[PDB]
UniProtKB/TrEMBL annotation, chains A, B:
Zn(2+) 3 binds at residue 55. Zn(2+) 1 binds at residues 29, 45, 82. Residues 5-84 form the Cation efflux protein cytoplasmic domain. It is found in: Cell membrane. This is CzrB protein. The chain holds residues 200 to 288 of 291 of the full protein. Zn(2+) 4 binds at residues 58, 62, 80, 82.
C-alpha cells in the first residue's frame, strides 16, 4: 504494501538498523514506511532491556535517527522503545 | 496542515492526552497526524523522567494507545518516549 516504500528499500533499511543495534538493543521490529514528496518516513519498535533508563534508550534513539537520515536521504524515523516482553516470537 | 487531521481534531486529541498524562509524564508534544481510509494515525513524543525505566514508560504507552483507540475510533498511535531534556521551551 500500500503506502509502504518498495519492499527492497524496507529491507535495506532493516539490514542497516540491525547492524547499528548490535550489542545495544535486542531487536528492531514492526517497520512501517511511506513516502510523501521529498520526504520518506519510517516508524519502528526498538526492543531494549526493560530496566534501561529512558534517558539511555533515548540516546540510542538520537544516534539512530541521525544515522538513518544520513544513510537514507529524505528519510526521517520515529522510534518506539519497548521492553523485552515485546520481542518477536 | 497538509496530510494532518483537521486542526480541531488534533486539539481534541491533545486535550485528551494532556488529561491522561496528569502526574504520569511531564508533557506530550510534536503531535503529527494523518488519515488513510478507515484509519487515522497519530505520532507524538511522551516526555518522562530520564531515570524512568523503559518497562515503566512502556506500560503507560500501552495504556495511552488503548485509551486513544477507544476515544478516537479508527485512530492508532505510535509513541516516542523522551527524557526531561527534550521538554518544550
Ligand atoms: Zn508499530
Ligand atoms: Zn513492538
Ligand atoms: Zn523485563
Ligand atoms: Zn509498545
Ligand atoms: Zn516527532
Ligand atoms: Zn520530543
Ligand atoms: Zn535527566
Ligand atoms: Zn527523541
Amino acid at each position: 504494501m500500500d503506502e509502504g516504500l518498495p519492499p527492497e528499500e524496507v529491507e535495506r533499511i532493516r539490514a542497516f538498523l540491525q547492524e547499528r543495534i548490535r550489542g545495544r538493543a535486542l531487536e528492531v521490529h514492526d517497520l512501517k514506511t511511506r513516502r510523501a514528496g521529498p520526504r520518506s518516513f519510517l516508524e519502528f519498535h526498538l526492543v531494549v532491556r526493560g530496566d534501561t533508563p529512558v534517558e539511555e534508550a533515548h540516546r540510542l534513539c538520537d544516534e539512530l535517527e541521525r544515522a538513518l537520515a544520513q544513510a537514507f536521504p529524505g528519510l526521517q524515523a520515529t522510534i518506539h522503545v519497548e521492553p523485552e516482553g515485546e520481542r518477536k516470537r
